[PDB]
Amino acid sequence: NWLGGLSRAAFPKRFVFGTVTSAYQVEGMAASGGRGPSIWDAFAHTPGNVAGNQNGDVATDQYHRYKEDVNLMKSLNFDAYRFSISWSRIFPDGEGRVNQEGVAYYNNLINYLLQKGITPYVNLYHYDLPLALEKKYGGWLNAKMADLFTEYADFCFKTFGNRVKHWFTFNQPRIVALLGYDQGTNPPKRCTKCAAGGNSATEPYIVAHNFLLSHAAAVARYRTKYQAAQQGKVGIVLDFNWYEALSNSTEDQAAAQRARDFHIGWYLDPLINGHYPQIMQDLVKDRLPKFTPEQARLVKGSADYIGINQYTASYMKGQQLMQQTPTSYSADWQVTAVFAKNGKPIGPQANSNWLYIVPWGMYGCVNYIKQKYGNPTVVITENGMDQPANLSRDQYLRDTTRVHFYRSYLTQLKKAIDEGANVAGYFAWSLLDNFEWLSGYTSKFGIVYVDFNTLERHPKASAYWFRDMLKH
């Protein structure tokens, strides 16, 4: 049938199903309600940076419409909602003065979610560093971010933690490091060539290191001050796309494993084992920061669960590892991504050029984490696909490809869980069509259609698929 034998009975007892948004992508009221600017506000308001010079000033206006959106997610039989708190909406300058109107918004949101029986899963950070912190401290280049983030996290735990029991610190630090500091295509637009300055060979590693230290510090604060009373959990969200060896050659198998290590091992080896992957230590050498023993012990075991954002897969082709002059994090891997095997593409692309529809990548990623890292508790924190711009409403609603996407990816996830993977939940990116970073409003990831002229919500076929699949 159209569910393909999927239902709540097909997953573990108490398995959590949710949808996901992030603050800047959906909230709107970017310069209102006392919110201070983030690095994304400054970036998106610069001509040329975003498709059509668009920005998140209004976005989906969830700020005003949150009760409509919560009613909708409940009507679709979800158990949970992953959203993020905008740091600069709480602390307009990133430190010091609290914006009480901002606090009130998140209180109202959290309270309504709970009233409607939806569990809040709350991200502290989703790319939206307060602009004041970027200017004053140099953002994630500065080790002082650990202190600054911890104080912000402390406030959130104190203010919301009696109700919020499921936290995440960061979202995809790999992408911040890569796009913000290697390629320089996301704020702060740093890179070797870039006008803002930077160094693609060193800064991504500094930034990743500071994310890990900041995460660890915030979790240490949670555990020592709040956890006894609040009895919640704190994790982190990491992107992981699957890498499959192009052939069974030694070089190609090594390349696939090297890619896994530079992609997910970069964060998981510190979080699980207390060190960076050996291959990164060997290849990146002096450009890879060293944890002190005390720091490594703070970082190891500091995630109660691992959020994995899983979208896609590629093949990897290898070659002889060679001595080379350092140029970038990306070039450090010494691999070649390949998107076809035996003359056939790995999968068709969704609207985003990077997003190949490869359901077996979900199995690959989950099974790999199970086998490599001692089967830690995993939550699939994002999974989804996008439609292009300029379709009619009815074309958006008839999202047959997305229905197929979810049925196939969830079937592969089920396969991994049935084989013993410790997966505790699954969250669809996204509840709503939203502001998709560089793509602005030209990329539509929602299971619910948003008319960006009127702001009206209309559930797509995929929303009704979930409703049918998830009926209690």
Ligand X SMILES: OC[C@H]1O[C@@H](O[C@H]2[C@H](O)[C@@H](O)[C@H](O[C@H]3[C@H](O)[C@@H](O)[C@H](O[C@H]4[C@H](O)[C@@H](O)[C@H](O)O[C@@H]4CO)O[C@@H]3CO)O[C@@H]2CO)[C@H](O)[C@@H](O)[C@@H]1O
The string of DSSP letters for 188-243 reads T---SS-TT---TTTHHHHHHHHHHHHHHHHHHHIIIIIHHHH--EEEEEEE--EE
For residues 63 and 29, is the Cβ–Cβ distance under 8 A? Answer: yes
Q: Does 267 bind ligand X (CB under 6 A)?
A: no
Tell me how many degrees the CA angle 384-380-108 measures, rounded to the nearest 5: 85
Minimum gap (Å) between residue 5 Cβ and ligand X = 28
**Contact flag: residue 330 with ligand X (CB under 6 A):** yes
SS3 content of the chain, % helix, strand, coil (to 5): 45, 15, 40
Residue 8 CB: number of other CB atoms within 10 A?
A: 16
Output 61 or 147, the one with its CB closest to Zn ion. 61
By CB under 6 A, tell whether 175 contacts ligand X: yes
From the list Zn ion, ligand X, none, partner contacted by residue 121 (C-beta under 5 to 8 A by kind): none
What are the angstrom distances between the C-alpha of 116 and each of 69, 81, 111, 360? 11, 11, 9, 35
The binder of Zn ion chosen from 10, 45, 57, 64 (CB under 5 A): 64
Token representation of residue 236: 């982190």
Which listed range, 61-69, 73-81, 171-179, 237-245, lies at the site for Zn ion (CB under 5 A)? 61-69
Select the residue interacting with ligand X from 83, 105, 311, 441 (CB under 6 A). 311
Q: Which of 436, 440, 441, 442 binds ligand X (CB under 6 A)?
A: 436
Q: Does 147 bind Zn ion (CB under 5 A)?
A: no
For ligand X, give the closer residue by CB, 295 or 310. 310
Specify the stretch interacting with ligand X by CB under 6 A; choose among 102-110, 136-144, 287-295, 327-335: 327-335
Residues 6+ apart with CB under 8 A from 21: 62, 81, 82, 83, 84, 430, 431, 432, 434
How many residues are recorded in the chain? 472
* x/- letters, 51..80, toward ligand X (CB under 6 A): ------------------------------
- Contact between 34 and 99 under an 8 Å Cβ cutoff? The reply is yes
Q: Which of 4, 10, 61, 77 binds Zn ion (CB under 5 A)?
A: 61
Residue nearest to Zn ion (CB): 64
State the number of binding residues for ligand X (CB under 6 A): 21
Q: How far is the CB of 32 from Zn ion (least distance, A)?
A: 9
Question: Which residues is 82 bridged to in the sheet?
Answer: 20, 121
**Would you say 251 and 338 are in contact if contact means Cβ atoms under 8 Å apart?**
no
233 Cβ contact list (under 8 Å, min separation 6): 165, 166, 167, 304, 305
Site for ligand X in 353-392 (CB under 6 A): 354, 382
Closer of 33 and 326 to Zn ion (Cβ): 33
CB contact at 8 A, 350 and 403: no
Amino acid letter, residue 112: Y
Contact partner, 181, from ligand X, Zn ion, none, Cβ < 5-8 Å per class: none
Contact region with ligand X (CB under 6 A), list: 26-34, 94-102, 304-312, 399-407: 304-312
DSSP 81-105: EEEE--HHHHSTTSSS---HHHHHH
Tell which one of 314, 328, 334, 412 touches ligand X (CB under 6 A): 314
Chain contacts with Zn ion (rule: CB under 5 A)? 61, 64
Chain contacts with ligand X (rule: CB under 6 A)? 22, 171-172, 175, 178, 239, 241, 309, 311-312, 314, 330, 333, 335, 337, 354, 382, 429, 436-437, 445
